[PDB]
Design a protein around this ligand. Structure first.
Ligand SMILES: CCCCCCCCCCCCCCCCCC(=O)OC[C@H](COP(=O)([O-])OCC(O)COP(=O)([O-])OC[C@@H](COC(=O)CCCCCCCCCCCCCCCCC)OC(=O)CCCCCCCCCCCCCCCCC)OC(=O)CCCCCCCCCCCCCCCCC
Ligand SMILES: CCCCCCCCCCCCCCCCCC(=O)OC[C@H](COP(=O)([O-])OCC[N+](C)(C)C)OC(=O)CCCCCCCCCCCCCCCCC
Ligand SMILES: CCCCCCCCCCCCCCCCCC(=O)OC[C@H](COP(=O)([O-])OCC[N+](C)(C)C)OC(=O)CCCCCCCCCCCCCCCCC
Ligand code: SF4
Ligand code: SF4
Ligand SMILES: [Zn+2]
Lengths: 49, 96, 45, 115, 115, 95, 176, 52, 209, 52
C-alpha cells in the first residue's frame, strides 16, 4: 500500500514539471526531478524553489 | 566621468592612462581595462548643501554605527561651506 | 531595552546521552549451533 | 601484605613478589653509596633525610596498600624503580662532584633580559 | 680567555688530517654519484668541483671552524651517498642556469648601481 | 523522514536502533536563519565613577623575575606537594 | 577521575564459552557490521545538488573583498592605512594623495588575493566600514594575474555585491 | 574553566593501537559530556577583557 | 582576586618554587649560576653549559624532583651577547605536578653535550637546533638537518639570516629540473616600525648607562 | 564534521581558520540560536559514535 503511494508521487512529479518534456529537461539539466513551491523569479530567468 | 585618451584607452578616477609609447598597454589586447564608471568625485558634488541653524554641526555619515566616526564642523566662515573629512558632505549656516 | 544574549533556556537543555549503547542481540550459542546441525541433516537426507 | 596485584597498570612494569625486601635492599644500598660522598655535601644530607624517611615507613607498615598511601610515590613498583634511579644518580654524583664550587661565572650580561 | 672548548681537533695539524680524509671520501664517491644520479657531467668535472669547494676555504686557520666545515661536508656525504638528495640538489653546485655575471667595473657600470 | 514505514523497520532492525528519533539529517528543528537583533551587555569597567585605570591595569602589575640566587639543618623540599592518586569514575569505572 | 577502556575479563562458564565459539565460527559480529552498512543504504543521502543547491552560510562569512561607498556614492575609504598595517600577510598596498577637491582618498588600493588569508582583520580595523570580505566564494580564475586586485576591481565588486553586503552588516553590526 | 566541568579520563592497559583507539573514542564521549555542561552553565556578560 | 581584568596571584606556588630553587643551587653549586622565579610562577635555573648532563640527570632521577618528561628543548639567538645562543630545557614532573626551565649558553663554535643519554626525546630537538641555529651537540647519535632542504646552506633562525633567504627555486625547461637562483621579490617585504617612543613598563626600566 | 564547521562559520565566518580565540577572550559573541543548534548536534552524536 505504501509502495502504491510512492509510485503516485513519482508520477505527480512528471505532471508537476509540465509533462514528460518538462520532466526530462530538468532531469538532464539539473539531475533532480523534485517539485517545489516557486518562491520567485529574477530578471535573468532563474527560478527559485 | 570616464574620458577616453587619443589612443582610446579609458582614464581612471586616479588619472591613470598609458601614454602612446608604453608597451604595457599590450596586456589589454584581446581583453579589457577595468574602470569603475561611478566617479566618487562627481557624485559627492551632486549632493545638496545642508542649511543648518548653528555655528557647529555634527556628522556621522548616516546609519549611526554604520557610518563614520562622529565629528563636529565649524560653520562660522561664510566664504565656504563646512565639509566633512570622512563623507564629503557639505553644510552651511542659515542666516538667522 | 534589556540585554539579549545567546543563553541557555531557562529550565536548561534536555539530557544528552554520551555512554556506549551496543545493544545485545541474537540467539544463544546453543540455539545457533543446533539450527546449523539441523539444516545439515535435512540436506543430507 | 595481602592478595597480590594482577597488574600494576603500567605497561612494561612487572609486579614485584617481594616489595618490602627489595625496597629495604635498595634504600640501604643508597645509604652505603652516600657514605663515600663528602659529609658537608647537600646531596648526602638531603638524600639521607628522605631515604631514611622512606626506609622507616617500609619497616613500620607491613601492608603494601597502606605503604603505597604513606610513601606517596604511586604503586610500590613505581617506588622501587625510583629507588634504583636514585642509586644510579648517587653513583654518578661521585664522579661529577657537583658539591665543588662554581667552575666559572658567566659573562657580564649573559642572563640580562631585556637586553 | 683564549682557552676554548674544542670540537674535535686540538690543533690545525690534527684538523687538516680530517680535511684530507674527507677529500678522499668525496673523490671515491663522485664516480658512483654520476652513475647513480644519472648526471650528464664527467667524473673529472665533479672531482674538479670538489676541489673548488675545498679551495674556497683555503684561508681559514682556526681549528674549530675547520672542524665545523668538515662536519658539514660529512653530512652532505651521507645525503648524497644515501640518495637523500636528488638530481636537482647535486647539480646546484654547478649553477648551470645562472648566466655569467659581469666582474669588471665598466660592465657593472653599464648594467646597474651595484659595487 | 520521507522513508516509508517498511524501510524504517528494515533499517531500524538491521542497525538495531530507533534511527528515526535521532536522524543525522537536519529538518525543521534547527534555528531560524534570520534572528531578532541582539543587545549585548557591557563590561565591568563601563562605569562613570571609581573606574580609574591605575587600579585595573594588569600590565603594570607585572614585575621582573625574582632572583632567588645569583653568582654575582633544613628539611628537603619538593617542587610541589606530591600529586593525589586519581579515583575511579563512579559513572562507569570499566568501559 | 579515570575509567578503564579495556580491562574486563571474560566469563568462563560453558554458555559464555559456547557463545564466543559461535561468534568465532559463525561470524556473528562480522554479520552485525554488515547490517549497519545495510541500514545506511536505505537512509537518505546527505548530498546536495550543487550548483542548483548551495551549502548554508552565515552573514559573517569571509569571502571576496570589496570596497564600499556611502549612500551618496562617495568612497568610504580615507586612506588611513590601518588595513595595510594589520594585514598579517602584507597583502594590501595603498598609496594616497589629496584629491582635486581636497579629500583624503586613495590612488592605489591593491589586494594580492594569493597573499590573503581571508582573516577579516582588515574589515575589523577599518573605521568607516569601507573594506569588507563579502559573501562570494565563486571567483576562481584561469590565471594568477586575475587574482591581483586593484582599486577599480574592488570598487566594482562593491557595486556588484552592495545589496547583499549591506544586509549582512545590518545583521551582524550589533555583534561587532 | 576546566575545573568546573566533570569528565573522566580514559586509560589504557596494554599500550597498543587498540587501546589508543578506545581512549580516543571514549574521549569523544566525554567531550559530549563536557559540552552538555558548557551549554547549560554558560554565563552572561562580556566576551573580551574590558581593558581597551 | 576580585579585580575582574587582572590575573590572580598564587603566592603558595611562588614560595614553593623559590625554595626548590634554593634546593637545587645548594645541591649543584658547581654549575648553577642563577635561579629566578617569575611573577606568573615559573622557576628558571641558569647553569654553566658544562653541567647539562649532571643537572638534567639529577632533576630526572632525584626523588624530590622526578622531572621525567622533556617537554621542549629550544634555543634563542641574542646577538648582542658574546655567547649569542641561549639553550633552554623545559621539563615536566608528573609526580609533583611541576615544571622547571633550565637555561644555558653557547656560541657559534663551542659545542654543547647532547642530552640524549638523559632524555631520548632530545634527539630530534637537538637536530632542529643545529639545523636552525647552527649549534653543535657533541656525541649525538645522528646530527643532521631535519627541517631545512637538502643542501640548504645557512641557519635560518639566527637573527642575522634574512627572512626570505638568499636563494629561491623554480623549474627550468632547458635543464628539465628544479633549479635554485638568487632571490628576487616582485614585492619587497615592507618593514614597519611599530615601537613607540614612550616607555610602557616602568618596573623593567634598565639602569642608565 | 561538516555540521561542526557550520558552528565555526557562524561565530567567526570561517569553516576552519576562525581566528576567533584571541588574547583577552574571543572576537565576537555567539550569534543567537547557535547553542540551540549545538544541543541538537550533541543530542544525536552518541549514536553516530556507536555506529562507528
Ligand atoms: C528490490 C526491489 C526493487 C523495487 C523497488 C520498488 C520501490 O518503489 O521501492 C522504493 C519504495 C520507497 O522506499 P523509500 O526508501 O521509503 O523511498 C523514500 C521515499 O519514500 C521516496 O520519496 P520520493 O518523494 O522521492 O518518491 C517519489 C519518487 C518515486 O520513486 C519511485 O517511484 C521508485 C520506483 C522504483 C521502481 O520520485 C522519483 O524520484 C522517481 C524518479 C525515478 C526513480 C528511479 C526509479 C528506477 C527504478 C528502477 C527502474 C528499472 C527499469 O519502497 C517502498 O515504498 C517499500 C518497499 C521497499 C522495496 C521493496 C519492494 C517490494
Ligand atoms: C551433523 C553431522 C556431522 C556433520 C557436522 C559438520 C560440521 C558442522 C559444524 C562445523 C562448523 C563450521 C563453521 C563454519 C566454518 C568456520 C570458519 C572459521 O574457521 O572461522 C574462523 C575465522 C577466524 O576467526 P578468529 O577471529 O577466531 O581468528 C583467530 C583464530 N584463532 C583464535 C583460533 C587462532 O573466522 C573467519 O573466517 C573470518 C572471515 C573474515 C571474512 C568475512 C567476510 C564477511 C563474510 C560475511 C558473509 C558470510 C556468509 C557467506 C555465505 C556465502 C553463501 C554462498
Ligand atoms: C536488500 C536486502 C535486504 C534483506 C537483507 C537480508 C538481511 C541481511 C543481513 C542483515 C544483518 C543483520 C545483523 C544481525 O542481525 O546479526 C546480529 C547478531 C549479532 O550477534 P553478536 O555477535 O552481536 O552476539 C550475539 C550472539 N551471541 C549471543 C552468541 C554472542 O548476529 C547473529 O546472531 C546472526 C547470525 C547469522 C549467522 C550467519 C552466518 C552463517 C551463514 C551460513 C550460510 C548462509
Ligand atoms: S582578510 Fe586578512 S589577510 Fe586578507 S587582506 Fe584582509 S587583513 Fe589581509
Ligand atoms: S582601513 Fe578602511 S579607510 Fe583605512 S585605508 Fe583601509 S579601507 Fe581605507
Ligand atoms: Zn560625515
Amino acid at each position: 500500500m505504501e509502495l502504491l503511494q510512492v509510485l503516485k508521487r513519482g508520477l505527480q512529479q512528471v505532471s508537476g514539471h509540465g509533462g514528460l518534456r518538462g520532466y526530462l529537461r530538468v532531469l538532464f539539466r539539473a539531475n533532480d526531478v523534485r517539485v517545489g513551491t516557486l518562491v520567485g523569479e529574477d530578471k535573468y530567468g532563474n527560478k527559485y524553489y | 566621468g570616464v574620458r577616453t585618451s587619443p589612443t582610446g584607452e579609458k582614464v581612471t578616477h586616479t588619472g591613470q592612462v598609458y601614454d602612446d609609447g608604453d608597451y604595457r598597454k599590450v596586456r589589454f589586447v584581446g581583453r579589457q581595462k577595468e574602470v569603475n564608471e561611478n566617479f566618487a568625485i562627481d557624485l559627492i558634488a551632486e549632493q545638496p548643501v545642508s542649511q543648518v541653524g548653528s555655528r557647529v554641526i555634527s556628522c556621522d555619515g548616516g546609519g549611526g554605527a554604520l557610518g563614520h566616526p562622529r565629528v563636529y564642523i565649524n560653520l562660522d566662515k561664510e566664504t565656504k561651506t563646512g565639509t566633512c573629512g570622512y563623507c564629503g558632505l557639505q553644510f552651511r549656516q542659515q542666516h538667522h | 531595552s534589556k540585554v539579549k544574549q545567546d543563553m541557555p533556556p531557562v529550565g536548561g537543555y534536555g539530557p544528552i546521552d554520551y555512554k556506549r549503547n551496543l545493544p545485545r542481540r541474537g540467539l544463544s550459542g546453543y540455539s545457533m549451533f543446533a539450527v546449523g546441525i539441523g539444516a545439515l541433516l535435512f540436506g543430507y537426507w | 601484605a595481602g592478595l597480590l596485584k594482577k597488574t600494576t597498570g603500567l605497561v612494561g612494569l612487572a609486579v614485584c613478589e617481594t616489595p618490602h625486601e627489595r625496597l629495604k635492599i635498595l634504600y640501604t644500598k643508597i645509604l652505603d653509596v652516600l657514605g663515600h660522598i663528602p659529609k658537608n655535601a647537600a646531596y648526602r644530607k638531603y638524600t639521607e633525610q628522605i631515604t631514611n624517611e622512606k626506609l622507616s615507613m617500609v619497616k613500620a607498615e607491613p601492608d603494601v596498600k597502606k605503604l603505597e598511601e604513606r610513601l606517596q610515590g604511586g604503586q610500590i613498583e613505581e617506588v622501587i624503580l625510583q629507588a634504583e634511579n636514585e642509586l644510579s644518580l648517587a653513583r654518578k654524583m661521585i664522579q661529577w662532584k657537583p658539591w665543588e664550587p662554581l667552575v666559572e661565572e658567566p659573562p657580564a650580561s649573559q642572563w640580562k633580559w631585556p637586553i | 680567555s683564549t682557552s676554548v672548548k674544542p670540537i674535535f681537533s686540538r690543533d690545525m695539524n690534527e684538523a687538516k688530517r680530517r680535511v684530507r680524509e674527507l677529500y678522499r671520501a668525496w673523490y671515491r664517491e663522485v664516480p658512483n654519484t654520476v652513475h647513480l644520479f644519472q648526471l650528464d657531467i664527467s667524473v673529472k668535472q665533479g672531482r674538479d668541483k670538489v676541489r673548488e669547494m675545498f679551495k674556497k676555504n683555503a684561508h681559514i686557520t682556526d681549528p674549530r671552524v675547520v672542524d665545523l666545515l668538515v662536519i658539514k661536508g660529512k653530512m652532505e656525504l651521507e645525503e648524497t651517498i644515501k640518495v637523500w638528495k636528488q638530481r636537482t640538489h647535486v647539480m646546484r653546485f654547478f649553477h648551470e642556469t645562472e648566466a655569467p655575471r659581469p666582474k669588471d667595473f665598466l660592465s657593472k657600470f653599464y648594467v646597474g648601481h651595484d659595487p | 523522514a520521507s522513508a516509508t514505514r517498511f524501510i524504517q523497520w528494515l533499517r531500524n532492525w538491521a542497525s538495531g536502533r530507533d534511527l528515526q528519533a535521532k536522524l543525522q539529517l537536519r529538518y525543521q528543528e534547527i534555528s531560524k536563519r534570520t534572528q531578532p537583533p541582539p543587545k549585548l551587555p557591557v563590561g565591568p569597567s563601563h562605569k562613570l565613577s571609581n573606574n580609574y585605570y591605575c587600579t585595573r591595569d594588569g600590565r603594570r602589575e607585572a614585575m621582573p623575575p625574582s632572583i632567588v640566587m645569583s653568582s654575582q639543618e633544613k628539611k628537603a623540599v619538593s617542587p610541589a606537594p606530591p600529586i593525589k592518586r586519581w579515583e575511579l569514575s563512579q559513572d562507569e569505572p570499566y568501559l | 577521575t579515570y575509567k578503564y577502556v579495556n580491562l574486563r575479563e571474560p566469563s568462563m562458564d560453558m554458555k559464555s564459552v559456547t557463545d564466543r565459539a559461535a561468534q568465532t565460527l559463525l561470524w556473528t559480529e562480522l554479520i552485525r557490521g554488515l547490517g549497519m552498512t545495510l541500514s545506511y543504504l536505505f537512509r537518505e543521502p546527505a548530498t546536495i545538488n550543487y550548483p542548483f543547491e548551495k551549502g548554508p552560510l552565515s552573514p559573517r562569512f569571509r569571502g571576496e573583498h570589496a570596497l564600499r561607498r556611502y549612500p551618496s556614492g562617495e568612497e568610504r575609504c580615507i586612506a588611513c592605512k590601518l588595513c595595510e598595517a594589520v594585514c598579517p600577510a602584507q597583502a594590501i598596498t595603498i598609496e594616497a594623495e589629496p584629491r582635486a577637491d581636497g579629500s583624503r582618498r586613495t590612488t592605489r588600493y591593491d589586494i594580492d588575493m594569493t597573499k590573503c588569508i581571508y582573516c577579516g582583520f582588515c574589515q575589523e580595523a577599518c573605521p568607516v566600514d569601507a573594506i569588507v570580505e563579502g559573501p562570494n566564494f565563486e571567483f576562481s580564475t584561469e590565471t594568477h594575474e586575475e587574482l591581483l586586485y586593484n582599486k577599480e576591481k574592488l570598487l566594482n565588486n562593491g557595486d556588484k555585491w552592495e545589496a547583499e553586503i549591506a544586509a549582512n552588516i545590518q545583521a551582524d553590526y550589533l555583534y561587532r | 574553566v576546566y575545573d568546573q566541568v566533570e569528565f573522566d579520563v580514559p586509560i589504557g592497559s596494554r599500550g597498543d593501537c587498540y587501546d589508543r583507539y578506545l581512549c580516543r573514542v571514549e574521549e569523544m564521549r566525554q567531550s559530549i559530556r563536557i559540552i552538555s555542561q558548557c551549554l547549560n552553565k554558560m554565563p552572561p556578560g562580556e566576551i573580551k577583557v574590558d581593558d581597551a | 582576586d576580585t579585580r575582574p581584568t587582572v590575573r590572580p596571584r598564587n603566592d603558595v606556588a611562588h614560595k614553593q618554587l623559590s625554595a626548590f630553587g634554593e634546593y637545587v643551587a645548594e645541591i649543584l653549586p658547581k654549575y648553577v649560576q642563577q635561579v629566578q622565579v617569575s611573577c606568573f610562577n615559573e622557576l628558571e635555573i641558569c647553569i654553566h653549559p658544562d653541567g647539562v648532563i649532571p643537572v638534567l640527570t639529577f632533576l630526572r632521577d632525584h626523588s624530590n624532583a622526578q622531572f621525567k618528561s622533556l617537554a621542549d628543548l629550544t634555543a634563542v639567538d641574542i646577538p648582542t651577547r658574546q655567547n649569542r645562543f641561549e639553550i633552554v630545557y623545559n621539563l615536566l614532573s608528573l609526580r609533583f605536578n611541576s615544571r622547571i626551565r633550565v637555561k644555558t649558553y653557547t656560541d657559534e663554535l663551542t659545542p654543547i653535550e647532547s642530552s640524549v643519554p638523559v632524555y631520548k626525546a632530545a634527539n630530534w630537538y637537538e637536530r632542529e637546533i643545529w639545523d636552525m641555529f647552527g649549534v653543535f651537540f657533541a656525541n649525538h647519535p645522528d646530527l643532521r638537518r631535519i627541517l631545512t632542504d637538502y643542501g640548504f646552506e645557512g641557519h635560518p633562525f639566527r637573527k642575522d639570516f634574512p627572512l626570505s633567504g638568499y636563494v629561491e627555486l623554480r623549474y627550468d625547461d632547458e635543464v628539465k629540473r628544479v633549479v635554485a637562483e638568487p632571490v628576487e621579490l616582485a614585492q619587497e617585504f615592507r618593514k614597519f616600525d611599530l615601537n613607540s617612543p614612550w616607555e610602557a613598563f616602568p618596573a623593567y626600566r634598565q639602569p642608565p648607562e | 564534521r561538516e555540521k561542526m564547521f557550520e558552528f565555526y562559520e557562524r561565530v567567526s565566518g570561517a569553516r576552519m581558520h576562525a581566528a576567533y580565540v584571541r588574547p583577552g577572550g574571543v572576537h565576537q559573541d555567539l550569534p543567537l540560536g547557535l547553542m540551540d543548534d549545538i544541543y541538537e548536534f550533541s543530542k544525536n552524536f552518541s549514536l553516530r559514535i556507536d555506529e562507528l
